[PDB]
């Protein structure tokens, strides 16, 4: 759940959440945990929750960086993710090469490709990789 | 242009000298020497590629080599990244029975 | 508030850039206040996305470029 100007967490009184900036700038709070559910949930692959919440950041400065940067599944990608550029970043970060494929189609930042087909190969499929390279002018290759 | 092995051995020696991977290969080939091509790869870290040769024209290093490549991959864990089989399963190597030996 | 705005700084290549989430989970493009420009250091802040609604239940990206030299 998000704060409300300065607050400090003092400690936790039950579910009816309580928060303090020091002695004012205060909360009673309907909760909304994140994480707990999550590394357990995650640990059991489970998404249902997040999803269900429809909770969806990954950036605030960043926010993918707990371990969503050091990703845990691309199932994560699925809860949230955006622009082809962003998507692309994911395409490396996850290595989401599904998103890459399209991403690629949509990339056209060469270098980007340029590494990537190999990488793609590296991960698999040269049947495809050949194409990738085909426009890439690694003709000789 | 006229062609020559002898030139090639000395040159091979040279080939070793030159410092970019690629020429040396042609040589190795040119001589006819898978072995040489493959050894060369070991130094450069040509690994995916090395596997193709090792497969195509079979010195069955595909088995040997694949394990190592896979190991790198392995280092960079994820099961898909690991990737596994030689005679049977994922690959059926010698059970496939097809065109390089 | 519903409107929750969360923000952090990203400094992406020279440019210190302001990620802002103003999320207006508001019950409407609630009216918004005011913002002011300024000379800064070897930088100057330099952008504001113009509107001042806090669109209902809605999330927004408000970008501030800063001028980094």
Briefly characterize the structure:
The structure is cut from a larger assembly and holds chains A (141 residues), B (101 residues) and C (69 residues). By secondary structure, chain A is mainly α.
What's the layout of helices and strands?
The structure is cut from a larger assembly and holds chains A (141 residues), B (101 residues) and C (69 residues).
Chain A: E1 17-19, E2 27-29, H1 35-43, H2 48-53, H3 75-79, H4 84-93, H5 97-105, H6 111-123, H7 126-134
Antiparallel strand pairs in A: 1-2
Helix pairs in contact in A: 4-5, 6-7
Chain B: H1 5-17, H2 22-31, H3 34-44, H4 47-56, H5 61-75, H6 79-82, H7 93-96
Chain C: E1 4-12, E2 15-24, E3 38-39, E4 44-45, E5 58-67
Antiparallel strand pairs in C: 1-2, 2-5, 3-4, 4-5
Note down, in words, how this protein is organized.
The structure is cut from a larger assembly and holds chains A (141 residues), B (101 residues) and C (69 residues). With 141 residues, chain A is mainly α. Chain A is built from seven helices and two strands. The radius of gyration of chain A is 21 Å and the shape is elongated. The longest helix of chain B is centred in the last third of the chain and has 15 residues, at 61-75. Chain C has no helices and five strands. Chain C is mostly beta strands and 69 residues long. Chain C has strands spanning 4-12, 15-24, 38-39, 44-45, 58-67. Chains in contact: A-B, A-C. The A-C interface holds A 2-4, 57, 59-62 and C 1, 4, 6-10, 19, 21. It is classed as transport protein.
Q: How many strand segments of chain B?
A: 0
Spatially, the strands of the biggest sheet of chain C line up as 1-2-5-4-3
Radius of gyration of chain C from the CA trace?
13 Å
In helices, the fraction of residues of chain C equals under 10%
Count of discrete alpha- or pi-helical segments spanning 4 or more residues of chain B: 7
**DSSP strand content of chain B:** under 5%
Helix and strand pattern of chain C: EEEEE
Largest sheet of chain B: none
What structural category arises from helix and sheet content of chain B? Answer: mainly alpha
Give the DSSP E fraction of chain C (strand runs of 2 or more residues): over 45%
Contiguous helical run count of chain C: 0
Intertermini distance of chain C: 36 Å
The biggest sheet of chain C, with number of strands, parallel, antiparallel or mixed sense and barrel status, is: 5 strands, antiparallel
N-to-C series of helices and strands of chain B: HHHHHHH
Query: Based on helices, strands and strand pairing, what is the structural class of chain C?
Result: mainly beta
What fraction, in percent, of the residue positions of chain B are helical? 55-70%
Shape of chain B: flat
- Give the radius of gyration of chain B: 16 Å
Silhouette of chain C: elongated
Q: Quaternary arrangement of the chains shown? A: part of a larger assembly
């Amino acid at each position: 759940r998000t704060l409300d100007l300065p607050i400090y967490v003092t400690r936790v009184k039950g579910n009816n959440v309580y928060c303090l900036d020091r002695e004012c700038r205060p909360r009673v709070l309907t909760i909304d945990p994140t994480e707990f559910k999550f590394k357990l949930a995650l640990i059991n692959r489970k998404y249902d929750e997040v999803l269900h919440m429809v909770r969806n950041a990954k950036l605030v400065g960043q926010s993918i960086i707990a371990y969503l940067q050091k990703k845990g599944y691309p199932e994560v990608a699925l809860h949230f993710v955006k622009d082809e550029k962003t998507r692309f970043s994911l395409a490396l970060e996850c290595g989401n090469i599904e998103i890459a494929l399209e991403a690629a189609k949509a990339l056209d930042d060469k270098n980007c490709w340029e590494k990537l087909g190999e990488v793609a190969l590296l991960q698999g499929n040269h049947q495809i990789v050949e194409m990738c390279y085909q426009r890439t002018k690694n003709f000789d290759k | 242009a006229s062609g020559n092995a002898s030139m090639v051995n000395k040159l091979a020696e040279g080939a070793e000298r030159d410092g970019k991977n690629n020429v040396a290969f042609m040589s190795y080939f040119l001589q006819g020497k898978l072995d040489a091509c493959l050894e060369l790869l070991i130094r450069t870290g040509r690994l995916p590629e090395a596997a193709f040769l090792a497969r195509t024209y079979l010195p069955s290093q595909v088995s040997r080599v694949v394990k190592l490549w896979r190991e790198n991959l392995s280092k960079v864990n994820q099961k898909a990244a690991e990737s596994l089989a030689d005679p049977t399963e994922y690959e059926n190597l010698f059970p496939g029975l097809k065109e390089a030996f | 508030d519903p409107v929750y705005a969360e923000a952090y700084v990203h400094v992406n290549q020279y440019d210190i850039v302001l990620d802002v989430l103003v999320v207006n989970q508001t019950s409407d493009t609630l009216q918004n206040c005011t913002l002011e420009l300024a000379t800064l250091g070897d930088l100057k802040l330099v952008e504001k996305p113009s509107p001042l609604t806090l669109a209902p239940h809605d999330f927004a990206n408000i970008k501030a470029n800063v001028k980094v030299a």
